[PDB]
Amino acid sequence: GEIQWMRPSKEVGYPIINAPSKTKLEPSAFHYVFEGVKEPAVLTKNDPRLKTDFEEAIFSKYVGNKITEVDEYMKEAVDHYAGQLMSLDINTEQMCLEDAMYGTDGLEALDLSTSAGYPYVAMGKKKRDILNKQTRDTKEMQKLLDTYGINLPLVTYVKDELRSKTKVEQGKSRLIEASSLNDSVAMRMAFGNLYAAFHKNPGVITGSAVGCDPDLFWSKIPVLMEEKLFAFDYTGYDASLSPAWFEALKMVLEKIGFGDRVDYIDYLNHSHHLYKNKTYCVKGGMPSGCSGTSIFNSMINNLIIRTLLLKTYKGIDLDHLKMIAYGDDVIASYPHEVDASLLAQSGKDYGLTMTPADKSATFETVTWENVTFLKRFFRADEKYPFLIHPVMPMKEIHESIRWTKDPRNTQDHVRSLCLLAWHNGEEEYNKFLAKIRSVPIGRALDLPEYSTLYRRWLDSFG
RNA sequence: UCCAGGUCUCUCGGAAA
RNA sequence: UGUUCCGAGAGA
RNA sequence: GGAG
Ligand SMILES: [Zn+2]
């Protein structure tokens, strides 16, 4: 992914967009109860704590495109992956406007509490002005689909979120591409049925974990896996992707019945963006906020691994590789050991930058003890060791409860966090609850006891 | 002075029944 | 327990 | 930037 040009919105008639310039993240009741080092991300460039140039930094992700052509290993990957997906009897029919808009089995509705993107955002129009869930009316949407059509520019925003000190300094804030309501809707008519398939079928056939509940899914995963596991991290995954990859994805899509609508895939490859007072063209790179981006980035991952395999281990039978991706996150297994430091080398030739998993500063052996998926470890229940806890480290939970975007959320916020923390076990969780309750708000809350969570976790299993 | 900040998935919560 | 609308948190 |  790489910018082709950038110039001031007003030069070509596009409006300026003003994002709010101040974060909603205040310090929380529990700010000093817990220790933590993440702070709000950098939103503007007239900002003190910046240690280097802002814009220069947020855009450095678009490093370059590297390949242009699908090679034979990519074609092989494609073939193997495509034939995997045909096993699922996936409805290849367009989804009707009503189901696209308002949901159906396997796909939730458009979010009524989010921007409608271009151009509605430059006319103070909202989704609630067009969509209505209680009548599921389509008329005004079809009318707007006639009017503006599709393939509209995306609006760029900075994600307002907690961030590492290092990254606030280096200005490594994260970018959001606001999808047009129109484009979101066209995408769901074309691929709603594929989404509903993947959402229903997380595992090793899809290689996606989208649609899973970690509390119930962590128990199915080691069954689905092979023996020796491998994993790694990606640097700038989505931006790092390049045209050949989007081409290979189209080939999979052609192969499983969605051929008449692969041009839509071109519209994620070649994209135009509104960012504040500027306007830019990007070729290569998955955009952050498009419809499907979660499904599509996983598919492309299931293609990258398979490819790098085929390149790095001649004659390798991918018929025996077991993997699950959630976008760039991945947990992968082969019956025989595979060396991530090798794949990471091949990776370069495909424009991908692969580093060792979980920030561990050298390539060593993945094992159920140190492996991670969606920021969770795997840890078997002491009583029933076939039930696997998803375990997120307190450290992460600690950072979260220190800040808030609205204090009247505090009960829910903290409740949520408990639901996560207790997998660390009764000793850590009762102590969590102690620290919480050491402040007058803490004691005001209704928090569940360790007994209740365990009892409910087990009962959820049948 | 209010509003503004994507795609999805899971879960919790509040309502209404 | 089954849905419906809304809120929130987390993950990618 | 978007309504008063
Ligand atoms: Zn262009």
Q: What is the DSSP letter of A21?
A: S
Q: Strands A26-27, A403-404: parallel, antiparallel or unpaired by DSSP?
A: antiparallel
Q: What is the DSSP letter of A68?
A: -
Q: Is the CB of A20 under 7 A from strand B?
A: yes
Q: Are A331 and A373 in contact (CB under 8 A)?
A: yes
Cβ neighbours of residue A427 under 8 Å, at least 6 residues apart?
A: none
Q: Is A385 in a helix, a strand, or coil?
A: coil
Q: What is the DSSP letter of A33?
A: T
Give the method used: X-ray
How many Cβ atoms are within 10 Å of A315's Cβ, its own excluded? 5
Q: What are the residues facing A389 on neighbouring strands?
A: A379
- The span from the first CA to the last CA of chain A, in angstroms, equals 46
What six digits make up the tokens of A133?
A: 């869930």
Q: Class of A375-462 per CATH?
A: mainly alpha
Residue A159's identity, in one-letter code, is K
Mutual angle of helices A410-421 and A426-437, in 10-degree steps: 160
Q: Is the CB of A196 under 7 A from strand B?
A: no
List C-alpha distances in Å: A105 to A95, A109, A194, A317, A356. 12, 10, 12, 35, 38
Residue with tokens 């390949």: A67
Four-way CATH pick for A213-242+292-367: 2.40.30.10, 3.90.1150.10, 3.90.1170.50, 3.30.70.270: 3.30.70.270
Cβ neighbours of residue A332 under 8 Å, at least 6 residues apart?
A: A229, A230, A231, A305, A321, A322, A323, A324
Cβ neighbours of residue A278 under 8 Å, at least 6 residues apart?
A: A6, A7, A8, A9
CA dihedral (A333, A335, A340, A342) positive or negative: negative
What six digits make up the tokens of A63?
A: 């490093």
Q: Are A156 and A275 in contact (CB under 8 A)?
A: yes
A328 annotated ligand-binding residue:
yes
* Nearest nt (C1') from A294 Cα: B8
In angstroms, the CA A248 to CA A303 distance is 8
Q: Are A338 and A232 in contact (CB under 8 A)?
A: no
Q: Where are the domains of chain A?
A: 1-13+70-202+243-284, 213-242+292-367, 375-462
Q: Is A349 in a helix, a strand, or coil?
A: helix
In angstroms, the CA A64 to CA A244 distance is 13
Nearest to A205, CA basis, from A335, A68, A298: A298
- Asked whether the bond before A153 is cis by omega within 30 degrees of 0, the reply is no
φ, ψ of residue A249 to 5 degrees: the values are -60, -45
* Nearest nt (C1') from A123 Cα: D2
List C-alpha distances in Å: A172 to A109, A158, A315, A328, A416. 32, 10, 41, 18, 28
A116: Cα separation from own chain's centroid: 20
- In angstroms, this model's resolution equals 2.8
Q: Is A167 in a helix, a strand, or coil?
A: helix
Residue A253's identity, in one-letter code, is L
How many Cβ atoms are within 10 Å of A252's Cβ, its own excluded? 22
Burial class for A248, CB neighbours closer than 10 Å (0-12, 13-18, 19+): buried
Nearest to A119, CA basis, from A151, A157, A159: A151
Residue with tokens 């085929």: A310
Backbone Cα Rg of chain A: 23
Q: Are A303 and A248 in contact (CB under 8 A)?
A: yes
Helices (H), A96-180: 97-102, 127-130, 139-148, 165-169
In angstroms, the CA A81 to CA A329 distance is 18
* Secondary structure element (H or E) that encloses residue A307, with its range: helix A293-312
Q: What is the CA(A281)–ligand 1 centre distance, in A?
A: 5
φ, ψ of residue A279 to 5 degrees: the values are -150, 120
In angstroms, the CA A400 to CA A414 distance is 9
Burial class for A381, CB neighbours closer than 10 Å (0-12, 13-18, 19+): middle
- Maximum Cα–Cα distance across chain A: 67
φ, ψ of residue A407 to 5 degrees: the values are -55, -25
A47 annotated ligand-binding residue:
no
In angstroms, the CA A307 to CA A341 distance is 15
Burial class for A283, CB neighbours closer than 10 Å (0-12, 13-18, 19+): middle
Q: Is the CB of A338 under 7 A from strand C?
A: no
In terms of residues, how long is chain A? 462
Q: Are A130 and A3 in contact (CB under 8 A)?
A: no
Q: Is the CB of A113 under 7 A from strand C?
A: yes
For strand B, give the nucleotides within 7 A of a protein CB. Answer: 3-13
Residue with tokens 């509490």: A113
φ, ψ of residue A228 to 5 degrees: the values are -65, 125
* Secondary structure element (H or E) that encloses residue A389, with its range: strand A388-391
Exposure string (b/e) for A338-374, b if CB count within 10 Å is 16 or more? bebeebbebbeebbbebbbbeeeeebeebeeeebbbe
Q: Are A327 and A294 in contact (CB under 8 A)?
A: yes
